[PDB]
Structure 1
């Protein structure tokens, strides 16, 4: 019903999801009473394989992960999908024998939904984890802004630009590829806008710091002013980063 979060997800689910609906509407206008429904055992023979292989892979994946939200969330989706296949398989059993079976109609129709739903749940949970990785980079950068306050030496500044430069760069790559990955356009701009504002400010922050350093080591006036514009740059920078963090978490 709602649009898919990511194109990758959507690629996997749009073609299928659609098919169900035709089936949902289509059953209401029964096309049997003569046409009947063929034997789809073969079709179900494979799904039941692909599904046990999703649980193996998913199962492999849960072990090989530091993430804990994924660990708890992911398992329910295995069984949702694995349970759902069973319904399909019975339905195909029922139809070997009574192509006209009414509950097998529903058994086709609910089982297929279950596979879709549960597979969506895997993809969203795995994604939710990708976003968290990005978020972490974000949060860590944020911390690195807080320490801009304590820099008072060109020697210190150089490490700090050397440290913080490639944090910034990583973050850039991540969000540029994440904005490409998402279906909604409104959210896309929110990221690109927000992240362009940041990329601009990095040089400004470096500058505003060099000005601070010099006045601190210059025994002169307007020391406060250089400080103000410093803090401001960091404030504004953080505002944008926390926005990126927040927009990354929108599904609505």
Structure 2
């Protein structure tokens, strides 16, 4: 029942807590002597919020290029719409009989269905966001493979002018993503991996400076420079691939 991110948690955790509070008072098929007041107007507001959520969702499916969104968002629309129909029915049943036991069951089932379908849409949305972050990580991995072909100081200046701000963007993205995660062990892994990558960048540029300046020399320390460059690229690449793996981790809850 734990939520994947702090954004999802703030939206859904209060709804889950309130359903569990209602369940205390009403087990399936349980009778009580408390008249439920007319729920027509609060349910109509849920109905308006549902149709609006489905409208936004459908606009994404119609315009997106993400095949996973096109596949996973439409079943969640059906979930939320079916669940909303149970709440409309519960309100109609309670209007004629405020003690209606089947209406109390429809309230719990309807509410659970809204929460479950909203959870599905939000997790699907979050998974698409993670794919965008991974694309940025892979872009850095690809340009790191270009380091081996840099052979002049002019080309090194060009290389650092693209890689420097590019790395700053990746660092900012991982920082915001780790902050949103609810699993502490996953946050630590991302922070440490991203810190190792940040520290290795000036190490890489230093090795490239020595490589380029000792390239065509007999007594030269090119060998040590080329070795330090390839080793730094390998270590940076393994840590970014660790970030990509951590970014896709899911815990046993639930």
**CA shift for structure 1 position 6:** 1.2
The Cα offsets for residues 77-110 of structure 1, whole Å up to 9 and x where unpaired, read as 1111111100111111111112222222221111
Helix, strand or coil: the match of 2:248?
Answer: coil
Alpha-carbon distance in structure 2 between the residues aligned to 1:203 and 1:88 = 59
Cα deviation, residue 73, structure 1: 1.3
1:245 to partner: Cα distance: 0.9
Distance change (3 Å), C-alpha of 1:103 and 1:32 = closer
The C-alpha deviation readout for 1:206-247, integer Å capped at 9, x for no partner, is: 011112222212233543322221111011101110111111
Q: 1:177 to 1:230 in 2, by over 3 A?
A: same
Mapped partners of 2:64, 2:243: distance in 1: 25
How far did residue 150 of structure 1 move?
1.4
How far 1:167 sits from its partner (Å)? 1.3
56-65 or 136-145, which deviates more: 56-65
- Correspondence for 1:121: 120
Higher mean alpha-carbon deviation, 156-165 vs 28-37, is at 28-37
Matched residues in 1 for 2:123 and 2:222: separation? 50
Give 1:24 deviation, angstroms.
1.9
Task: Quote how far apart the aligned CAs of 1:173 are.
Answer: 1.3
Aligned length, in residue pairs: 251
Residues in 1 aligned to 2:129 and 2:29: alpha-carbon distance in whole angstroms: 43
Does the CA contact (< 8 Å) of 2:29 and 2:101 recur in 1?
no
Aligned pairs for 1:87-236 within 5 A? 87-236=86-235
Distance in 2 (CA, whole Å) between partners of 1:217 and 1:68 is: 50
Question: 1:102/1:32 Cα in 2 relative to 1: closer, same or farther (>3 Å)?
Answer: closer
Q: Distance in 2 between matches of 1:84 and 1:220?
A: 77
Deviation at 1:31, TM superposition (A): 7.8
* TM-score (norm. length: structure 1): 0.93
RMSD: 1.7
Q: Is the 8 A contact 2:29 2:102 kept in 1?
A: no
| Shift in Å, 1:39 | 2.2
Distance 1:24 1:220 in 2: 80
1:78 equivalent in alignment to 2:82: no
Identify which range, 24-33 or 240-249, moves more after superposition: 24-33
Cα distance, 1:84–1:31 mapped onto 2, change above 3 Å: closer
Gaps of 5+ in 2: none
User: Post-superposition shift, 1:47?
Assistant: 0.5
| Uncovered stretches (5+) of structure 1, i.e. residues with no partner | none
Partner Cα distance (1:77, 1:220) in 2:
68
- The alignment's TM-score, normalised by the length of structure 2, stands at 0.93
Quote the Cα distance in structure 1 between the aligned partners of 2:226 and 2:104.
71
Mean CA deviation greater in 137-146 or 60-69: 60-69
Structure 1 residue 161 displacement after superposition: 0.9
Instruction: Measure how far apart 1:135 and its partner are.
Output: 0.6
Following the alignment from structure 1 to structure 2, what is the Cα–Cα distance between the partners of residues 10 and 116?
A: 12
Give the secondary-structure state (helix, strand or coil) at the position aligned to 2:151.
Answer: coil
What are the Cα deviations for residues 28-47 of structure 1, in whole angstroms up to 9, with x where unaligned? Answer: 29885322323212111110
Aligned partners of 1:33, 1:80: CA distance in 2, in Å? Answer: 29
